[PDB]
Design a protein around this motif. Structure first.
Motif, PDB file in Angstrom:
ATOM      1  N   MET A  19       0.820  -1.204   0.000  1.00 31.14           N
ATOM      2  CA  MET A  19       0.000   0.000   0.000  1.00 31.14           C
ATOM      3  C   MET A  19       0.858   1.260   0.000  1.00 31.14           C
ATOM      4  O   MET A  19       0.581   2.209  -0.743  1.00 31.14           O
ATOM      5  N   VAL A  20       1.903   1.294   0.830  1.00 30.69           N
ATOM      6  CA  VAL A  20       2.756   2.478   0.875  1.00 30.69           C
ATOM      7  C   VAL A  20       3.508   2.635  -0.443  1.00 30.69           C
ATOM      8  O   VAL A  20       3.575   3.731  -1.015  1.00 30.69           O
ATOM      9  N   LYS A  21       4.068   1.535  -0.953  1.00 25.32           N
ATOM     10  CA  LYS A  21       4.775   1.596  -2.228  1.00 25.32           C
ATOM     11  C   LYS A  21       3.858   2.063  -3.357  1.00 25.32           C
ATOM     12  O   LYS A  21       4.283   2.834  -4.227  1.00 25.32           O
ATOM     13  N   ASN A  22       2.596   1.610  -3.360  1.00 23.64           N
ATOM     14  CA  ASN A  22       1.692   1.922  -4.463  1.00 23.64           C
ATOM     15  C   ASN A  22       0.983   3.263  -4.293  1.00 23.64           C
ATOM     16  O   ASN A  22       0.708   3.932  -5.293  1.00 23.64           O
ATOM     17  N   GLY A  38       1.677   5.906  -1.726  1.00 23.23           N
ATOM     18  CA  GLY A  38       2.411   7.050  -1.224  1.00 23.23           C
ATOM     19  C   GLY A  38       1.638   7.897  -0.235  1.00 23.23           C
ATOM     20  O   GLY A  38       1.216   7.406   0.812  1.00 23.23           O
ATOM     21  N   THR A  39       1.407   9.167  -0.578  1.00 18.28           N
ATOM     22  CA  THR A  39       0.809  10.096   0.373  1.00 18.28           C
ATOM     23  C   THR A  39      -0.662   9.808   0.645  1.00 18.28           C
ATOM     24  O   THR A  39      -1.194  10.290   1.651  1.00 18.28           O
ATOM     25  N   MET A  40      -1.330   9.035  -0.216  1.00 20.57           N
ATOM     26  CA  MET A  40      -2.738   8.706  -0.004  1.00 20.57           C
ATOM     27  C   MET A  40      -2.958   7.817   1.216  1.00 20.57           C
ATOM     28  O   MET A  40      -4.095   7.716   1.698  1.00 20.57           O
ATOM     29  N   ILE A  41      -1.899   7.170   1.716  1.00 20.42           N
ATOM     30  CA  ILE A  41      -1.985   6.391   2.948  1.00 20.42           C
ATOM     31  C   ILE A  41      -2.489   7.249   4.105  1.00 20.42           C
ATOM     32  O   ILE A  41      -3.147   6.744   5.023  1.00 20.42           O
ATOM     33  N   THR A  42      -2.208   8.553   4.074  1.00 20.97           N
ATOM     34  CA  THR A  42      -2.631   9.451   5.144  1.00 20.97           C
ATOM     35  C   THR A  42      -4.143   9.658   5.173  1.00 20.97           C
ATOM     36  O   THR A  42      -4.679  10.089   6.198  1.00 20.97           O
ATOM     37  N   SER A  53       4.259  22.457  -7.915  1.00 26.98           N
ATOM     38  CA  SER A  53       4.009  22.062  -6.538  1.00 26.98           C
ATOM     39  C   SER A  53       4.434  20.614  -6.294  1.00 26.98           C
ATOM     40  O   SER A  53       4.325  19.753  -7.170  1.00 26.98           O
ATOM     41  N   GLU A  54       4.925  20.350  -5.082  1.00 25.76           N
ATOM     42  CA  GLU A  54       5.309  19.006  -4.670  1.00 25.76           C
ATOM     43  C   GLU A  54       4.257  18.345  -3.787  1.00 25.76           C
ATOM     44  O   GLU A  54       4.576  17.390  -3.072  1.00 25.76           O
ATOM     45  N   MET A  55       3.006  18.824  -3.835  1.00 22.73           N
ATOM     46  CA  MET A  55       2.057  18.537  -2.760  1.00 22.73           C
ATOM     47  C   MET A  55       1.665  17.066  -2.651  1.00 22.73           C
ATOM     48  O   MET A  55       1.219  16.649  -1.578  1.00 22.73           O
ATOM     49  N   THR A  56       1.803  16.266  -3.705  1.00 20.08           N
ATOM     50  CA  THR A  56       1.466  14.852  -3.571  1.00 20.08           C
ATOM     51  C   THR A  56       2.661  13.988  -3.196  1.00 20.08           C
ATOM     52  O   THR A  56       2.497  12.778  -3.007  1.00 20.08           O
ATOM     53  N   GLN A  57       3.845  14.566  -3.075  1.00 25.04           N
ATOM     54  CA  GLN A  57       4.976  13.807  -2.570  1.00 25.04           C
ATOM     55  C   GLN A  57       4.753  13.512  -1.091  1.00 25.04           C
ATOM     56  O   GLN A  57       4.339  14.406  -0.344  1.00 25.04           O
ATOM     57  N   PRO A  58       4.972  12.281  -0.642  1.00 24.91           N
ATOM     58  CA  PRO A  58       4.859  11.995   0.790  1.00 24.91           C
ATOM     59  C   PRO A  58       5.958  12.690   1.577  1.00 24.91           C
ATOM     60  O   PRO A  58       6.961  13.166   1.034  1.00 24.91           O
ATOM     61  N   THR A  59       5.747  12.747   2.888  1.00 25.97           N
ATOM     62  CA  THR A  59       6.747  13.322   3.775  1.00 25.97           C
ATOM     63  C   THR A  59       8.030  12.499   3.742  1.00 25.97           C
ATOM     64  O   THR A  59       8.022  11.296   3.464  1.00 25.97           O
ATOM     65  N   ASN A  60       9.154  13.165   4.005  1.00 26.03           N
ATOM     66  CA  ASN A  60      10.396  12.458   4.280  1.00 26.03           C
ATOM     67  C   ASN A  60      10.807  12.587   5.738  1.00 26.03           C
ATOM     68  O   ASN A  60      11.921  12.201   6.091  1.00 26.03           O
TER      69      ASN A  60
END
Length: 378
Positions: A14-17, A19-23, A59-66
């Motif tokens: 799920m995280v690999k596929n 990304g930020t949608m996990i939130t 914008s980088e808004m869909t990149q997950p946090t690091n």
């Protein structure tokens, strides 16, 4: 089935596929939030519609946090649930012992989540003479000793000015004994200084003894990295495997960790092999060795040999702290199933890639409308 190995596969997939949608943040909210904190960057002259499109495109808004701590909190929230994670957060860390035995000995054959916090040891190596009017604590070099004509201070790693308990007269003698231009801003514990050779070397040696005694019983460790390790229950003893999960601040996301398969790569070290590297990270005093292990364990995938070189060489002592708790696979898989339902209900598609694209398009449209709300025809 509610088994620990299935929990690992599901959270990784799920995280690999996704990304930020996990939130679980709706795309429209993600875009509206990004617009509010990006509106100052929209160019004020010219075609405003195109000025807004430029900002949304960049914008980088869909990149997950690091953020490593945020990735670890997301892992604990998913695997333990909100209430179980808050209990886990309250329990204490324990320092990994020299050979890693206290962590090796605390991994019974159950589904276990380990949370690790890395600390760096801070101690000053440099001093500088300075005038009071020129000493600005909010801008001066941190973790450094400052000798003023009437005070000896330690500017700590957080920016606090710590008085070192010296009288105005003692500092006055040290301040005025250190006269050579090269020694006004120098290192604390020079191995060549001979206090018998000159009053200047005597004063530098004395100041070094003062600092050393004041830091003697001072414990200034500060947190420097965070990650988690999932250790599913296994049927046999030699099939037991661990899977470290991480993001790294300003470096990579948890999604990239999984995409580069670094959890699986490190799992091939085995439980003993991985923990021995983690323990050696704390016991080595060789910065090249420390840096090499830090890179192998913690770099973005494929960057193990460059991550800790040059400006990022690990010169300070490190310590590993850990805490362990049991994972209920039924709880974990239920939390992951609810994230999947949020994605499938709101961003349907034939595959995960199509759903992510749809999520991104909807976040971008929402960001555009929110920026145009503030900027279009006023």
């Amino acid at each position: 089935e509610k088994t620990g190995l299935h929990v690992h596969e599901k959270i990784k997939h799920m995280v690999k596929n996704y990304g930020t949608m996990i939130t679980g943040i709706p795309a429209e909210i993600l875009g509206q939030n990004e617009a509010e904190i990006s509106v100052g960057y929209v160019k004020k002259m010219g075609n405003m519609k195109e000025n807004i499109a430029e900002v949304v495109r960049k914008s980088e808004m869909t990149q997950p946090t690091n953020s490593a701590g945020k990735a670890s909190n997301e892992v604990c929230d998913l695997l333990l649930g909100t209430e179980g994670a808050s209990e886990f957060e309250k329990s204490s860390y324990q320092v990994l012992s020299g050979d890693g035995s206290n962590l090796k000995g605390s991994l019974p054959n159950k589904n276990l989540l380990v949370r690790v916090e890395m600390d760096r040891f801070n101690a000053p190596q440099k001093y500088q003479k300075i005038k009071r009017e020129e000493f600005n604590p909010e801008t001066a070099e941190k973790n450094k000793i400052y000798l003023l004509e009437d005070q000896l201070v330690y500017l700590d790693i957080f920016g606090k000015v710590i008085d070192l308990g010296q009288t105005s007269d003692t500092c006055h003698r040290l301040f005025n004994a250190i006269t050579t231009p090269f020694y006004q801003n120098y290192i604390l514990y020079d191995e060549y200084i001979d206090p018998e050779e000159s009053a200047e070397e005597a004063a530098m040696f004395e100041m070094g003894e003062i600092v050393k005694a004041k830091m003697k019983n001072i414990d200034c460790w500060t947190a420097t990295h965070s990650f988690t390790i999932f250790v599913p229950e296994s049927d046999s003893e030699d099939t037991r495997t661990l899977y470290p999960y991480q993001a790294y601040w300003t470096s990579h996301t948890l999604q990239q960790w999984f995409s580069g398969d670094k959890d699986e790569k490190l799992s091939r070290l085995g439980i003993d092999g991985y923990i021995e590297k983690l323990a050696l990270l704390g016991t080595t005093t060789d910065s090249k060795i420390r840096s090499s292990i830090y890179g192998e364990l913690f770099s973005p995938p494929g960057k193990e040999h460059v991550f800790c070189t040059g400006m990022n060489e690990k010169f300070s002592p490190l310590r590993v702290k850990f805490k362990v708790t049991e994972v209920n696979p039924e709880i974990a898989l239920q939390n992951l199933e609810e994230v999947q339902e949020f994605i499938d209900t709101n961003y349907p598609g034939e595959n995960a890639k199509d759903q992510c694209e749809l999520y991104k398009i909807k976040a971008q449209e929402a960001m555009t409308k929110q920026l145009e709300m503030r900027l279009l025809i006023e």
